[PDB]
Amino acid sequence: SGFDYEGLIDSELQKKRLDKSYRYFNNINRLAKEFPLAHRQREADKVTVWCSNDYLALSKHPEVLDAMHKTIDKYGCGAGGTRNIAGHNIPTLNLEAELATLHKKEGALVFSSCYVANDAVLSLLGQKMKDLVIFSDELNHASMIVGIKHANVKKHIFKHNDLNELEQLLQSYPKSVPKLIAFESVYSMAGSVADIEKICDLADKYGALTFLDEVHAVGLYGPHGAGVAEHCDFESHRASGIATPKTNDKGGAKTVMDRVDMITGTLGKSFGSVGGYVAASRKLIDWFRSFAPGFIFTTTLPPSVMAGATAAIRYQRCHIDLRTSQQKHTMYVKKAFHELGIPVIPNPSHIVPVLIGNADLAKQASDILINKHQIYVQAINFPTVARGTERLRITPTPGHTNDLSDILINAVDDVFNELQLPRVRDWESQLLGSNLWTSSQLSLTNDDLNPNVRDPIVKQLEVSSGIK
C-alpha cells in the first residue's frame, strides 16, 4: 500500500489538541425577536450574546426582514446561476449602486464574501503586475495574507501601524516600481485603527496603490457609516451628505476616502447579511468583473440576501443614532472595566478586548461565562492572536443597553475572581497597554444629517452589467 494519508491527518489533528488551539464551536441560535439573546441546544436555554459582529443589530431590523420576505416571494431563494448566466438582476444592481454611493466611488462589485473579495483583488493585482511590491501590516487578516501569498509577488511586512518602518521600506525602492499598501482601517482583534490619511500621503510620495479593508468599520464610522476613511473628513461628509464634498476637513481638495484606490467591506457584519465588496474607480471594477475567477465562476448570492443588505445600508446611512448609541454602550463597558481593573487592550474603536494572557484560562473564562452567567463571549487564542496575548472579545451594539452591560461587568468581574486572573495592577507589575468618536460627534442626531441621505433615488451602475 501507498502513502499513509490517515496517519498524516491524525498527527496534524493531534498537534491542534496538544497545543490547545483545537476549537469547539458553540451552538448559538440568535433570536431576532429578542436581540441580543440566543438559545443553545434547547430553546429554553438562553444566553446574552456579547461577541457577535452584528454590530448595529441590523440582522433583525424590520426593513431588512421585510426586504427579504418580499424578495423571496418574487424571486425565490437562489439566484439560480452566476452573474454571466441567469444570476444578474435588479437586487444585484441596487446593492452595487448603494455601496458605490456609500463610499462615494464610481463603482462597486459584490462577491460571495469579503474573504473572497480580498483574495480576488490582491491575487489579480499581483498576477497582472509581476513587478508589484506589496507592503502589508503585520496584523492584516487571514483573507489579506492569503490574497498576498496568491498574488505571488515581493512582499514586505511592516510592524503594526508603524509608518516610520513603512516609509523606510517604501523609500528603498525607485518610485517607478509598482507598489501596493495593504491595510485595515480597524483591526478586529485589538481594535486599533490605521492612520489612513498618512498612508495615503506615503502612497502619493512613493507611487503606491492603496488597498483598505474597512470590514470592521463600515456602518460604524463616519456620519453615514462609510468607515474610518469617511470619519477622517467627518464634517465635510456630514455637510455634503451623499454628494462628494467641495473640500476635505482641512480645506484641501480631496477627501481621504476619495484618495484610497480600493476599499473592501463585508455585508456580513454591520449590514446584517452576508457577502463582500470592493469600491473603486469604474476601470478597476470593470477589470475585476472581467478577470477575477472568484467573481466569475460562482453562484450569485440570493436576491433576498442582497435586498437585505441594501435595506440595511440605506437605513444606517441616515440613522447616525445607531453609531452614537453603539459608541456610548462601548464607552460605558470600557469605563466600568477600567474602574474594576479589568484589563482592556486600549483602543479608540468599538471593540473591547479583555486580556487574559493564557489559552486555557481564556477558554475556561468563556466556559464559565456561558454556563454560569449565561454570557456568550468567545476566547481568542493562537493562531488568531500571539500566544501569551489570549483574550475575550466583547463587541457592544445599540442593543446592549446599560442594564445588560451591568450584568456583563458584574459577571466578568466575578469570573476574574473565580479564576484569580490578573487585573490591570498585576499587569503593570509584570503588555499591549483616544477615541475616534468625539463628544461633539456623539451628540449629533439624525436631524443633523443632510436630508439628501434620506431615501436617495440611487441609480444603477453601467459597469455592473458591462460598459459600451
Add this chain to the structure above:
Amino acid sequence: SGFDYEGLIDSELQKKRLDKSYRYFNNINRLAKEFPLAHRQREADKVTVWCSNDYLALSKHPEVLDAMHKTIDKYGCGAGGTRNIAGHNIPTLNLEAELATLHKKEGALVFSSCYVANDAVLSLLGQKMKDLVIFSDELNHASMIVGIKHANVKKHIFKHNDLNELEQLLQSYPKSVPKLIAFESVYSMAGSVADIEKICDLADKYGALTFLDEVHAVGLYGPHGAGVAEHCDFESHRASGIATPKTNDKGGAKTVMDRVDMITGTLGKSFGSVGGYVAASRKLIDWFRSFAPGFIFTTTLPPSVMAGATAAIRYQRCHIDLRTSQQKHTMYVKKAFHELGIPVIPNPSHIVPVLIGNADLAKQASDILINKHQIYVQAINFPTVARGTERLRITPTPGHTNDLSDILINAVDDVFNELQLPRVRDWESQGGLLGVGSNLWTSSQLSLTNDDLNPNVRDPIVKQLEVSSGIK
C-alpha cells in the same frame, strides 16, 4: 515617475473587447410564482429561462420558501459571525447532517460556495503534502484549477476522460508517492460524464486519493439525487434508501460513493440556494474545519439560506419524479432537435449543448432568441470552450414541460433558418465535430416513481454530527 496602473488595466480590458469575450450580463429577474419565466428591466417584459442551473426548480419550491420565511422570523438575516464566533447554529448543524446523510458519509462541511470549498480542500492537501502529485482532468472547473495552483504541488493534466492516459501517468510513479485524482462527475459545458468507478479502481491500484466534484450532478443522479457516484450503485442505494447498502451493485462490500475520499457539491444549483460543501470521513472533515482559512475566517451563510437548502435536499431525496421528469424533458428536447437536424453535442446527461461553431453567430442567436422569441439561453464562447466549438447551453428542469419545450424547439429552429446556421447534415459534410453526426438514466430507472423508493427516505430523523462542532 510612477507606474501606469490605469494604462495596464485599460489594455487588459481592451484584450477582452478585441478577442470578443468581453461579457454583457443580462438583467434576469426570475419569478418564483411563474417558473421558468423572468422579467428584464421592466416587470412587463418577460422571457423563458432555459439556461439556469436551478436544475430541479427548487429555488421557488413552497417548502424551500416556507423554510426561509420561518427561519428569517426566528434568526433574522445574517448569521452575525463566523463558525468560531457566534455563527454556529442549528440550521448549520441540520444542513451538514443532511449532506452527510445524502452522500452516506461520516461528515460534511459547509462553505460560502463550492468555489471556496474546492479551493480550500485542494489548497490544504497540497500545502500539507508538498510531495503530492495531482492528476487533473483537462476540463476541470476554474475553482479546481485555482485550488490546484494554490496547492502548489506537481500536477499532471490528462486528456478529458482519458483513463488510459491517466493510468500511464499514475503508473510512472511508485505506489507510495502521495497522489490525488481531481475530476468532476458531470462536465457542464458539454455534459460528459466521468467513469467514477474505473477512477476509484485506478486510485486503489496506484495509491491515490480521489477528489470528486458533483456540482452538476447532485439532485440529478442516483435514486436520491446524491450524484453520479450514487448512480454507479443505483439499485443497491435504491433498496437501502438512506442506509448504507449491504453490498454494492456487483455484490462487493463498498459502493463507489463510499470509495470516493472527498465529494464536493454546491447548494446553488439543484438545491436552490447558495453555498458549497465537502462530504468525507470524520477525520478529513475535522481537518478542513480546523485548518482551512477559507472556512475559518469568513461569515457563516445566513441561517435562512441553509434552512432553504436543507428543505430542498430533504424534498428531492424522496421525489425521484423530479429526476425522471427532468430526464424526460431533456430527452424530449434532444430528440426534437435530432429530428430537425439541430446539432446537439451528444452526451448521457441533462445538458443540451447546441453547436453553433462561431462566436459571433452564437451571440447573435442568443440575442435573437431573447429579443424576438423571449427565450433566454446563453452563448458559450472562448475561453470557456475551444474556438470553433461555440454553443448555446440549454438546461431543462422539471418545470420545462413539453408546451415550453415546443416553444423552444420552434424558436431555435426558426433562429437556425434566420441565421442560416449549419444543421447536422451540414456538419457531416465537413467531417463532423464533437460527435454531431447511451444515457445515464435507463428506461428501467426512468419508469420508477416515489412509491419505488425505500420509505426510510420520506422524513428521516437526521441527527446532528459531533464533528460540525468539534470532537473530544
